[PDB]
Amino acid sequence: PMFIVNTNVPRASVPDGFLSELTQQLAQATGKPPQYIAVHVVPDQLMAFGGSSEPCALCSLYSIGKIGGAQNRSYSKLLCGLLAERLRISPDRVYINYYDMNAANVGWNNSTFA
Amino acid sequence: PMFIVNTNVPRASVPDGFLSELTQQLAQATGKPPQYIAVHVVPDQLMAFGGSSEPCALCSLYSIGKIGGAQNRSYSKLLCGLLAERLRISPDRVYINYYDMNAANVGWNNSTFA
Amino acid sequence: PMFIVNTNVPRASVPDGFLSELTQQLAQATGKPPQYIAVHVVPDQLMAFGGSSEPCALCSLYSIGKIGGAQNRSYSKLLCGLLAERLRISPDRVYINYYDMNAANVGWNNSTFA
């Protein structure tokens, strides 16, 4: 799985250990081993949510399977929780796009996961 | 809706008010309230278009519905217009990927839009 | 086509001529004219792959067609090869998301490709 967070929160406000926390919690949530989880945090961004620039985040979760209505509600609670607690971003200023990737459409290690 | 612009134009060349203008014009174009529009501009990027590092932009527009053939032509005229006028980017050096997202695949506020 | 590479490798480690090499090799691999190939490299990122901050890359290849099982295997061998040779990233620390875009969902030059 791959989780990306783009945010206007400054780098210095991203706590130590955050990428590891994301990795850990995503492995748990998706059921996939942490060796397969990749995470990417992009702070200091020029962004607005609903016309204003209070802390916000635009995020993506890509996974080969483990994507669906109930699962994605659960992921959203988890991820909005983490962004609120660690980055002080209000959950109503977070969007997360979920993508169910086909294995043949994910490259890794000179080939694909198919 | 979420609109992202990645560009090699420098930050200083992005006018004050550009995020607000995008918000307003996208609200009008999509018919969605401004409160639901998120915008993200990423200047100073290392990018090329057709092998050239002249000004260019790679963009994405995500929306739950309000995406389709005619609509995306209209959005492209609008947004290339804005990028030409405000950032001095030629329309033929802009790509915009359009995504019609399923509500269940968009997280927000600890749940999804489904 | 549009190819994006996000990496924790520093900017100074991205060799001169890299965006051109990508453009050229992607034109050849996809069969598309180089004029339609866009490339975007984002170094110095805060990211982890399998919990680790050793060099890694999270990438995307978008194309209108020319996406499929065998084609994507071949792209992955090409692209992982270039990331290894030029950026010294191990192929097993690269993910590449492949996207077959509908022409009606790609804006360019005030319109779409449909």
Side-chain angles (χ1 to χ4, degrees), chain A residues 1-10 12-84 86-87 89-114, chain B residues 1-10 12-23 25-27 29-76 78-84 86-87 89-114, chain C residues 1-10 12-87 89-114:
Chain A
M2 173 189 310
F3 180 63
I4 317 299
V5 177
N6 298 274
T7 180
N8 57 347
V9 167
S13 297
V14 181
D16 290 352
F18 187 53
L19 293 182
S20 284
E21 188 177 25
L22 290 171
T23 301
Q24 292 175 340
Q25 293 292 310
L26 288 162
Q28 294 179 306
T30 60
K32 289 189 173 191
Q35 294 92 340
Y36 291 88
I37 300 292
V39 298
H40 179 193
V41 175
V42 193
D44 296 292
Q45 297 302 287
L46 179 62
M47 49 176 48
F49 188 111
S52 63
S53 291
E54 296 89 9
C56 59
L58 306 177
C59 311
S60 298
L61 181 66
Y62 300 86
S63 180
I64 295 165
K66 312 304 294 187
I67 297 286
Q71 291 168 105
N72 297 348
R73 285 187 282 278
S74 182
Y75 298 146
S76 299
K77 179 183 188 177
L78 169 70
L79 294 166
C80 291
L82 285 165
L83 291 171
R86 303 299 183 207
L87 303 186
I89 301 169
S90 182
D92 69 357
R93 294 181 59 77
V94 173
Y95 285 151
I96 306 161
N97 283 333
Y98 293 99
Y99 298 83
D100 188 355
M101 294 300 295
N102 295 339
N105 287 337
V106 180
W108 174 71
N109 196 41
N110 307 313
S111 188
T112 67
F113 278 104
Chain B
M2 174 188 309
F3 177 65
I4 305 110
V5 178
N6 299 270
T7 183
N8 55 351
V9 165
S13 296
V14 182
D16 282 352
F18 190 52
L19 293 182
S20 284
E21 186 172 35
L22 291 171
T23 303
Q25 293 289 309
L26 284 162
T30 61
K32 307 255 185 186
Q35 293 87 350
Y36 289 89
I37 302 292
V39 177
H40 179 194
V41 175
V42 195
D44 295 294
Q45 297 304 99
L46 179 63
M47 45 169 62
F49 190 117
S52 160
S53 61
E54 292 289 332
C56 57
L58 304 178
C59 308
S60 295
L61 180 63
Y62 298 87
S63 181
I64 296 163
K66 308 305 294 187
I67 297 287
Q71 290 169 107
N72 297 349
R73 286 184 282 275
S74 179
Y75 294 146
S76 299
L78 170 69
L79 292 165
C80 291
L82 284 165
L83 294 167
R86 302 301 183 207
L87 303 187
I89 303 166
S90 182
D92 67 359
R93 296 182 57 71
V94 173
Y95 282 149
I96 309 159
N97 285 337
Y98 296 100
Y99 298 81
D100 186 355
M101 296 301 293
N102 295 340
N105 290 330
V106 182
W108 175 69
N109 196 34
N110 307 311
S111 186
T112 66
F113 280 106
Chain C
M2 175 189 309
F3 181 61
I4 305 112
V5 176
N6 300 269
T7 182
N8 54 353
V9 163
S13 298
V14 179
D16 290 351
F18 190 52
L19 295 180
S20 287
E21 188 176 29
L22 292 172
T23 300
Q24 293 174 340
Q25 295 293 306
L26 284 163
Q28 294 177 310
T30 60
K32 300 260 187 188
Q35 296 84 353
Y36 290 97
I37 300 291
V39 298
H40 180 194
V41 175
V42 192
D44 296 294
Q45 296 305 280
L46 180 62
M47 47 168 60
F49 186 112
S52 162
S53 61
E54 292 287 344
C56 59
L58 305 177
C59 309
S60 297
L61 179 66
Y62 301 86
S63 182
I64 293 165
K66 307 297 182 70
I67 297 289
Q71 290 170 104
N72 297 353
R73 287 185 282 276
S74 185
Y75 299 148
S76 300
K77 180 182 188 178
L78 170 71
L79 294 168
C80 289
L82 284 166
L83 297 167
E85 180 173 37
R86 301 303 185 204
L87 303 189
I89 300 167
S90 183
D92 67 359
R93 295 183 60 72
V94 176
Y95 284 152
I96 306 160
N97 289 146
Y98 296 102
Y99 302 80
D100 187 356
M101 299 296 294
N102 191 292
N105 289 335
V106 182
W108 175 63
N109 196 31
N110 304 308
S111 189
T112 69
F113 282 105

mmCIF file of all heavy atoms in Angstrom, chain C residues 2 20 70 105:
data_model
loop_
_atom_site.group_PDB
_atom_site.id
_atom_site.type_symbol
_atom_site.label_atom_id
_atom_site.label_comp_id
_atom_site.label_asym_id
_atom_site.label_seq_id
_atom_site.Cartn_x
_atom_site.Cartn_y
_atom_site.Cartn_z
ATOM 1 N N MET C 2 2.576 10.839 -18.927
ATOM 2 C CA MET C 2 3.099 11.650 -17.833
ATOM 3 C C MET C 2 3.760 10.703 -16.846
ATOM 4 O O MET C 2 3.123 9.755 -16.400
ATOM 5 C CB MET C 2 1.958 12.395 -17.152
ATOM 6 C CG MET C 2 2.196 13.205 -15.937
ATOM 7 S SD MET C 2 0.620 13.799 -15.143
ATOM 8 C CE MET C 2 0.033 14.434 -16.693
ATOM 9 N N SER C 20 15.630 14.597 -19.582
ATOM 10 C CA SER C 20 15.705 14.257 -21.004
ATOM 11 C C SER C 20 15.830 12.794 -21.265
ATOM 12 O O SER C 20 15.224 12.283 -22.170
ATOM 13 C CB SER C 20 16.943 14.955 -21.694
ATOM 14 O OG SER C 20 16.683 16.286 -21.836
ATOM 15 N N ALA C 70 1.777 -6.944 -19.823
ATOM 16 C CA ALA C 70 3.132 -7.092 -20.382
ATOM 17 C C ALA C 70 3.832 -5.792 -20.582
ATOM 18 O O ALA C 70 5.029 -5.699 -20.311
ATOM 19 C CB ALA C 70 3.084 -7.874 -21.743
ATOM 20 N N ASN C 105 -10.783 12.033 -20.537
ATOM 21 C CA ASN C 105 -10.385 12.453 -19.154
ATOM 22 C C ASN C 105 -8.957 13.027 -19.127
ATOM 23 O O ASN C 105 -8.355 13.127 -18.036
ATOM 24 C CB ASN C 105 -10.500 11.236 -18.208
ATOM 25 C CG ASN C 105 -11.943 10.849 -17.942
ATOM 26 O OD1 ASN C 105 -12.844 11.677 -18.054
ATOM 27 N ND2 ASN C 105 -12.176 9.576 -17.599
#
